């Protein structure tokens, strides 16, 4: 539809070299088809040059028909070499167009907001990408490999037969192509019913066998061996009764296709003989007619899949080109200002209402002030909604009402890249890229040198543990690697943050780790990396005993700030460590 | 090898009708190839009958060449209809041979002993069956569909060209077939390196995308969107650099194949023209030569896969035909006697030593006597090895030393079917066939009527629960069905046993269920079904409090019987219900 032009007139036409490769492919397409229809013509030339008074005139091959004997073979070889070079060049063109489409779409997805990414399946987006690019590739590949060469050659052959022999040869060839396509498309739509039935009966027989072998002791406790051999036999028999329909309908397909071409090639042999006996044609022209139409029958193998599979592929591109139209919700403000970094970073929540599912909020007119260069910890019950204090300041969501300020300027005005640069985050659950430990350290600042990586692991106290691993900091870590404990993951995240070196720091639920001792070490280390560097640190933890020592402690009771104090005057509440 | 004759001279040749279908297929094979090589011959006849002094002699088609114009089309249509009927008939022959092989092998597997079945993977045996039958099917299918018709047609065509034109035409055709096969086999072995590389690079690019989209919040916390778009772009570029090698090597394959046939068809056109200019041949014979050898080039599509895939298939049959050679270890005694059922069924262990992994035994010279028509429960710690008291009496294993007696006759002499008929078993874990609740009841005695099934569910007190299910006793139950609790499964097994109605009963670890109340009901019900019917019952339970009420209690302390008594005089040991 419009999707076809959206791809086919945008991605293959971008540069010079790629446009050159497209034109090369198209020239080879037409060149191949021209050589193709020259193979029968040189064949009739050979016939018509040796069909002479042999004993009277012709002396040697290479003087009577050597030129056209060589040109027959050269056109034959060239007509296939041009197809294969056309396919090998347009596969490159297609692959670069899919690479551009996939890399742009993936960049757009990484641009899209957290809200969109949280309402999608884990592999849903990537299978959309992959199926969409297979749809683009299959559609371009079919159009250049199969559909357009075949239509061009039907055009060339009907033109040749109309020029030399009459319109009725082209009428018979076009009616043959129409009948062959109608037959093939229809009956290969019918055959898939049969193939799915046979496949299902195969799985049924297999499952009978599996289920009877798993429950083997029950089979022989109840003496039912003959019963299960009978059930397997019956399921296998119901499988062969559907494999018969698959094979018989394939016989119908193939034999009907060749009945259509053989009826054409005989009718046009009768019509060519009728014109040989009238003096119009020569017996070489019978070979011309026969071989032109036969060569039409050769490239037609693609016709089985095409009408299902292009339709599927068109759907697969539709999904992908709908993904490119999802809008980002958090918008960078026009004429945004990267600012307030040298200013003493203070955070000012004012009257902020925020809530997922906006009818039911979490923060109710919240207002608070984080002083510059200090250490502030907010406290509340687990699930009070303190966990959004991240997402609202880092601007992965927006405040529905109220405003967020850094140094008396709204984050909704500051440049979004500049904003996200300023804050570093220790998340609750540290994610692991399936890569080295070294790269997971590096990911804080990807341009950092190896000595910077080791220094960061030193400052967050990991380097002895990565030495203790077998391969060193080159250890393969992740879901499919060397498993590491939650404490080592948290230290890993701390090292990421240190290597980033941001002015603003969050430590959201770093104390979600089970061990109290490991979190004691973790809190200690994050204190020494906070201290003396004016690193404005916010700690969001569910255990105030872990962070009773903060400069300022702000409590939150269901969307409102209640009081602010020290360890003792706020330990008077519940949740005490008397049971810890 | 010998495997080929083991299949090909045993399974397709068993009955009359199947032998008829084999001969029909083979006749169609040869018939098709004869018609095939008659298509070019009638084509030259057409040429050579219209190549006359047209203005002087020939008057109408249908009198000059109508017969051979029709015979050309009839041979054309018939030569493909015979292929398709040959394929559709031999697919039936092959499928029945695979059905016989698979059903016999599965019957043999159910014959094999528990020891063999316990040392195999759950799906290992069935994937051996399935892959072996696909190997048989592919080998028979290739040999009748592709390899033998092509060899026959090469033989026919080289015979025809040697007869009419000379040995050098057959030498060129055989050298073309050899060169085409050598080229195709070699280069399609090389192409698979490229295909696997490209497939791996595709998966690498996909995994880069998946891993970057999963860890999305970490992507935008650390501002690394451009980094991940660059990584995806680089992985996609490394994919297209291998897709180029796949497509270019496919171009090499296809264009080389057609270079070989086009060199043949031009060389033999030169040699046919050399013989037309000498008067030997006519210009129809050029079309005969050309079309015979071209038609040789048509069925050669199979040559890509054949040398890898037949080798794989041959391995797949080897595994299967090795499975048919595993020996059963527990042997039925020659001249065995079905006996000792009306005799009061008493069990006599004498001096029995038994052990898995024979160096380390479990039962050490065990000897015990179960009185006829009574109720006996053996007791011991969990893992003392009482759980083999089943497998030794039911004769799924054999006593390495010592002897087992039922009514003063050795089980190793009694007919194995007669032995396994006598004992009914309530297993520790009740297995569930993925079928109805009704069939799981029925499986105790598969010839029982529905009223028998309902009566058995009544006697073991399930019928209210199967009424309470939505669809009734037709409820779909199992791993992929309506989940049922362990107590209902145990009642289900009890009902199986009741429907079997055996003289001998075991209840091995029926008390493995968690609930004490459900097992109280279960013990109650199995008591009423034991009582008054002289059902010799052995209860193997780890909690003697459940079965303190037995007529006889035999204790087992690590492979030896220690004492025999009542509830109180044996409750003096440990494991008391004082902590229950």
Encoded tokens for B139: 């080998």
Residues 6+ apart with CB under 8 A from A156: A33, A34, A36, A37
* Collapsed DSSP state (helix, strand, coil) of residue A436: strand
Strand order in the sheet with A363-370: A363-370, A347-354, A401-406
Q: Angle at which helices B225-276 and A17-50 pack, to 10 degrees? A: 10
CB-count exposure of residue A363 (10 Å: 0-12, 13-18, 19+): buried
Q: What is d(CA B8, CA B216) in angstroms, rounded to the nearest whole number?
A: 59
Encoded tokens for B509: 């670890």
Q: What is d(CA A213, CA B124) in angstroms, rounded to the nearest whole number?
A: 10
In a domain, B338, yes or no: no
Do B140 and B193 belong to one domain? Answer: no
The reply to whether residue A417 touches residue B237, judged by beta carbons under 8 angstroms, is no
In a domain, A115, yes or no: no
- Residue whose C-alpha is closest to residue A356's, from A405, A329, A391: A391
Do B497 and B561 belong to one domain? Answer: yes
The reply to whether residue A50 touches residue B277, judged by beta carbons under 8 angstroms, is yes
In a domain, B341, yes or no: no
In a domain, B339, yes or no: no
Show which of B329, B364, B387 is a domain's final residue. B329
Encoded tokens for B396: 């799924």
Find the CATH number of the domain harbouring B124: 1.20.1560.10
Encoded tokens for B238: 């490394």
Do B215 and B273 belong to one domain? Answer: yes
Do B176 and B106 belong to one domain? Answer: no
In a domain, A539, yes or no: yes
Q: What is d(CA A10, CA B446) in angstroms, rounded to the nearest whole number?
A: 68
In a domain, B309, yes or no: yes
Chain B residue with the nearest C-alpha to that of A290: B43
Residues 6+ apart with CB under 8 A from A485: A518
**Surface of A (93-122) touching B: CB under 8 A:** 95-96, 99, 102-103, 106-107, 109-111, 114, 117, 122
Do B321 and B381 belong to one domain? Answer: no
* Collapsed DSSP state (helix, strand, coil) of residue B150: helix
Chain B residue with the nearest C-alpha to that of A124: B210
Q: Please enumerate, by residue number, every residue of B annotated as part of a binding site for Mg(2+).
A: 428, 508
Do B151 and B174 belong to one domain? Answer: no
* Collapsed DSSP state (helix, strand, coil) of residue B522: helix
Do B325 and B243 belong to one domain? Answer: no
Residue with token string 């599965």: B106
Name the β-bridge partners of B375.
B537
- Note whether B323 and B128 are within 8 A (CB): yes
- Residue whose C-alpha is closest to residue A260's, from A213, A288, A320, A300: A300
- Determine how β-strand B476-477 pairs with β-strand B552-556: unpaired
Q: Please enumerate, by residue number, every residue of B annotated as part of a binding site.
A: 191, 195, 257, 305, 308, 356, 360, 382-383, 386-388, 397, 428, 485-488, 508
Q: What is d(CA B273, CA A559) in angstroms, rounded to the nearest whole number?
A: 98
Show which of B329, B361, B391 is a domain's final residue. B329
The reply to whether residue A217 touches residue B114, judged by beta carbons under 8 angstroms, is yes
The experimental method, as deposited, was cryo-EM
Angle, vertex CA A60, rays to CA A55 and CA A64, nearest 5 = 95
Encoded tokens for A318: 């539709």
The reply to whether A257 sits in an annotated binding site is: yes
The reply to whether residue B240 touches residue A95, judged by beta carbons under 8 angstroms, is yes
Long-range Cβ pairs for the range B8-16 (8 Å, 24+) = B8/B140, B11/B97, B11/B98, B11/B100, B11/B101, B11/B136, B12/B93, B12/B94, B12/B97, B12/B140, B14/B100
8-state DSSP, B474: G
A214 shares contact with chain B (CB less than 8 Å): yes
Element (H, E) at A561: strand A561-565
Mutation for testing the B interface, residue in A44, A81, A82, A209 having most B CBs under 10 Å: A209
Q: What is d(CA A282, CA A290) in angstroms, rounded to the nearest whole number?
A: 13
Mutation for testing the A interface, residue in B110, B338, B442 having most A CBs under 10 Å: B110
B229-251 burial by CB neighbour count: b if 16+ within 10 A, else e? bebbbebbebbbebbbbbbbbbb
The reply to whether A548 sits in an annotated binding site is: no
Distance between the two ends of chain B, CA-based, in angstroms?
A: 67
Q: Which residues of A touch B54 (CB under 8 A)?
A: 276-279
- Max alpha carbon distance in chain B (Å)? 127
The reply to whether residue A500 touches residue B427, judged by beta carbons under 8 angstroms, is no
Residue in A210, A283, A500 nearest the CB of B126: A210
Residue ranges of E strands in A291-407? 347-354, 363-370, 375-379, 401-406
Chain B residue with the nearest C-alpha to that of A417: B223
Q: What is d(CA B290, CA A374) in angstroms, rounded to the nearest whole number?
A: 93
The CA distances from residue A495 to A499, A503, A537, B228, B439, in Å, are 6, 15, 15, 20, 62
The reply to whether residue A273 touches residue B417, judged by beta carbons under 8 angstroms, is no
Residue in B54, B213, B229 nearest the CB of A125: B213
A9 shares contact with chain B (CB less than 8 Å): no
Kindly report the number of other CB atoms within 10 A of residue A466's CB atom.
24
Do B10 and B50 belong to one domain? Answer: yes
Number of inter-chain CB pairs under 8 A, A vs B: 331
8-state DSSP, A473: G
Distance from CA of B546 to the nearest CA of A (A): 25
Residue ranges of E strands in B177-284? none
Do B43 and B121 belong to one domain? Answer: yes
The reply to whether residue B243 touches residue A91, judged by beta carbons under 8 angstroms, is yes
Distance from CA of A576 to the nearest CA of B (A): 33
8-state DSSP, A328: P
Distance between the two ends of chain A, CA-based, in angstroms?
A: 67
DSSP symbols for B35-65: HHHHHHHHHHHHHHHHSS-TTTS---TTTSS
Residues 6+ apart with CB under 8 A from A124: none
The reply to whether residue A255 touches residue B424, judged by beta carbons under 8 angstroms, is no
- Residue whose C-alpha is closest to residue A388's, from A357, A416, A431, A418: A357
The reply to whether A100 sits in an annotated binding site is: no
Q: Could you give the number of structural domains in chain A? A: 1
B420 shares contact with chain A (CB less than 8 Å): yes
Q: What is d(CA A436, CA A290) in angstroms, rounded to the nearest whole number?
A: 65
Do B7 and B43 belong to one domain? Answer: yes
Find the CATH number of the domain harbouring A490: 3.40.50.300
Q: Which residues of B touch A125 (CB under 8 A)?
A: 213
The reply to whether residue B73 touches residue A263, judged by beta carbons under 8 angstroms, is yes
**Residue B264, CB half-sphere, CA atoms under 13 Å: how many?**
27
- Ramachandran quadrant class, A62 (left: phi over 0; alpha: psi -120 to 50; beta: rest): left
Q: What is d(CA A68, CA A187) in angstroms, rounded to the nearest whole number?
A: 42
In a domain, B337, yes or no: no
- A397 lies in which domain range? 347-579
Do B156 and B170 belong to one domain? Answer: no
Reduce the secondary structure of A171-224 to three states and give it as a string. Answer: HHHHHHHHHHHHHHHHHHHHHHHHHHHHHHHHHHHHHHHHHHHHCHHHHHHCCC
* Collapsed DSSP state (helix, strand, coil) of residue A51: coil
Encoded tokens for A490: 């948290």
* Collapsed DSSP state (helix, strand, coil) of residue A532: coil
Q: What is the separation of C-alpha A181 from the centre of its chain, rounded to a whole number of angstroms?
A: 33
8-state DSSP, B104: H
Q: What is the separation of C-alpha B479 from the centre of its chain, rounded to a whole number of angstroms?
A: 21
Q: What is d(CA B567, CA B119) in angstroms, rounded to the nearest whole number?
A: 40
Q: Angle at which helices A283-297 and B17-50 pack, to 10 degrees? A: 140
Chain A residue with the nearest C-alpha to that of B427: A218
Do B128 and B247 belong to one domain? Answer: no
In a domain, B295, yes or no: no
The reply to whether residue A81 touches residue B255, judged by beta carbons under 8 angstroms, is yes
The CA distances from residue A556 to A268, A359, A394, in Å, are 91, 21, 19
* Collapsed DSSP state (helix, strand, coil) of residue B370: strand
- Note whether A25 and A91 are within 8 A (CB): no
Distance from CA of B555 to the nearest CA of A (A): 25
Q: Which residues of A touch B265 (CB under 8 A)?
A: 72-73, 76
Q: What is d(CA B206, CA B219) in angstroms, rounded to the nearest whole number?
A: 17
Q: What is d(CA B430, CA B493) in angstroms, rounded to the nearest whole number?
A: 6
What does this entry list as its resolution, in Å?
3.0
- Note whether A32 and A86 are within 8 A (CB): yes
Residue B177: phi, psi to the nearest 5? -65, -40
Name the β-bridge partners of A327.
none
Residue in A222, A225, A434 nearest the CB of B211: A434
Kindly report the number of other CB atoms within 10 A of residue B15's CB atom.
9
Q: What is d(CA B457, CA B492) in angstroms, rounded to the nearest whole number?
A: 8
- Note whether B330 and B397 are within 8 A (CB): yes
Encoded tokens for A300: 């037609």
8-state DSSP, B412: T
Q: What is d(CA A90, CA A93) in angstroms, rounded to the nearest whole number?
A: 5
The reply to whether residue B254 touches residue A92, judged by beta carbons under 8 angstroms, is no
Residue in B216, B277, B417 nearest the CB of A58: B277
Residue B326: phi, psi to the nearest 5? -70, 135
């Amino acid at each position: 539809a419009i999707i076809k032009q959206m791809s086919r007139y945008l991605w293959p036409k971008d540069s010079w070299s790629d446009k050159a490769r497209v034109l090369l492919a198209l020239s080879l397409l037409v060149g191949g088809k021209v050589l193709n229809v020259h193979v029968p013509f040189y064949f009739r030339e050979i016939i018509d040059r040796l069909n002479i008074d042999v004993a009277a005139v012709g002396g040697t091959v290479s003087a009577v028909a050597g030129a056209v004997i060589f040109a027959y073979g050269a056109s034959r070889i060239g007509a296939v070499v041009s197809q294969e070079l056309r396919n090998a060049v347009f596969s490159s063109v297609a692959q670069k167009a899919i690479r551009r489409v996939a890399t742009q779409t993936f960049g757009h997805l990484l641009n899209l907001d957290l809200s969109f990414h949280l309402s999608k399946q884990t592999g849903g987006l990537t299978r959309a990408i992959d199926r969409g690019t297979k749809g683009i590739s299959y559609l371009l590949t079919s159009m250049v490999f199969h559909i357009v060469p075949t239509a061009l050659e039907i055009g060339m052959v009907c033109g040749i037969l109309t020029y030399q022999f009459g319109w009725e040869f082209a009428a018979i060839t076009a009616a043959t192509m129409a009948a062959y396509t109608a037959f093939t498309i229809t009956t290969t739509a019918w055959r898939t019913k049969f193939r799915r039935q046979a496949n299902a009966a195969d799985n049924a027989a297999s499952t009978v066998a599996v289920d009877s072998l798993i429950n083997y002791e029950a089979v022989k406790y109840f003496n039912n061996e003959a019963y299960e051999i009978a059930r397997y036999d019956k399921a296998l028999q119901a499988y062969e009764r559907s494999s018969i329909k698959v094979a018989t309908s394939l016989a119908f397909l193939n034999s009907g296709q060749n009945i259509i071409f053989s009826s054409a090639l005989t009718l046009m042999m009768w019509l060519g003989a009728r014109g040989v006996l009238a003096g119009d044609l020569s017996v070489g022209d019978l070979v011309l007619i026969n071989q032109l139409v036969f060569q039409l029958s050769v490239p037609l193998n693609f016709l089985g899949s095409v009408y299902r599979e292009l339709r599927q592929s068109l759907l697969d591109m539709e999904t992908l080109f709908d993904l490119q139209k999802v809008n980002v919700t958090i918008r960078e403000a026009p004429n945004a200002k990267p600012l307030a970094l040298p200013k003493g970073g203070e955070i000012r929540f004012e009257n902020v209402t925020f809530g997922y599912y906006p009818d039911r909020p979490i923060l109710r007119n919240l207002s608070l002030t984080i002083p510059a260069g200090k250490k502030v910890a907010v406290v509340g019950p687990s699930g009070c909604g303190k966990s959004t204090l991240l997402r609202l300041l880092f601007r992965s969501y927006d405040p529905q009402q109220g405003k967020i300020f850094i140094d008396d300027q709204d984050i909704k005005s500051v440049t979004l890249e500049s904003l996200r640069k300023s804050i570093g985050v220790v998340p609750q659950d540290t994610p692991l890229f399936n890569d080295t430990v070294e790269l997971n350290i590096r990911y804080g600042n990807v341009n950092a040198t190896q000595e910077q990586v080791i220094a960061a692991a030193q400052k967050a106290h990991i380097h002895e543990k990565i030495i203790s691993w077998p391969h060193g900091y080159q250890t393969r870590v992740g879901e499919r690697g060397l498993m590491i404990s939650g404490g080592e993951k948290q230290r890993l995240a701390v090292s990421r943050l240190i290597l980033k070196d941001p002015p603003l720091l969050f430590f959201d639920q770093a104390t979600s780790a089970l061990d109290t001792h490991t979190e004691q070490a973790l809190m200690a280390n994050i204190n020494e990396v906070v201290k003396e560097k004016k690193r404005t640190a916010l700690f969001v933890a569910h255990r105030l005993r872990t962070i009773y020592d903060a400069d300022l402690i702000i409590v939150l009771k269901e969307g409102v700030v209640v009081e602010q104090g020290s360890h003792r005057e706020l330990m008077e509440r519940d949740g005490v460590y008397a049971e810890l």
